[PDB]
Structure formats: C-alpha cells, structure tokens
C-alpha cells in the first residue's frame, strides 16, 4: 500500500495505488515545447521501476507523496 502523486488526474493529486503497485515514479523527457515549457512530467504508481531511456529522467521511491510535480516538494 502507498499513496503517490499521479498526472492522470486534473489537477495533480495524491491517489492510492492499485494492488501490487507499491512504489511511485516520476518520468520527465523533452518534447517539442521543451524550450518554452520545460520537460514533460508524468507521475503515477508502479510495481517495477520504469526502464529509463538515455534521454528520459526516471525517479522511483516508496514513501507517500514522494513523487511530486517539480513545482511541489516531497511529503
């Protein structure tokens, strides 16, 4: 069991992860608007840490709300 920030909702909120997904992940990568808006932010739950492309940024953690949007601090 664990609560994690998710980008599936609007606004970003903290949700309880489905059974078997007990870590949070943040994934960021540049798209066409990276120069003006910065990197894409994708947040959610996961069982295993997502496999990171060389240009992607992936963070995995296992405490509640440890995966905030860059504009929010953990906890």
């Amino acid at each position: 069991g664990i609560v994690c920030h998710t980008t599936a909702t609007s606004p970003i909120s903290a949700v309880t992860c489905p059974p078997g997904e007990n870590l949070c992940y943040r994934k960021m990568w540049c798209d066409v608007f990276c120069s003006s808006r910065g990197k894409v932010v994708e947040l959610g739950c996961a069982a295993t840490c997502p496999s990171k492309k060389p240009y992607e940024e992936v963070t995995c953690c296992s405490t509640d709300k440890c995966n905030p949007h860059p504009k929010q601090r953990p906890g």
């Binding site: 980008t7 599936a8 970003i12 808006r37 910065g38 894409v40 947040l43 949007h69 504009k71």
Partner: peptide, 12 residues
C-alpha cells in the same frame, strides 16, 4: 494529462 515542469496546469 500532459504536464510540464513550468506550471501545475495541464496543457492538452
């Protein structure tokens, strides 16, 4: 939703 590091508002 697509989010970006620059704001808490989604962009799609």
């Amino acid at each position: 939703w697509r989010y970006y590091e620059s704001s808490l508002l989604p962009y799609p």
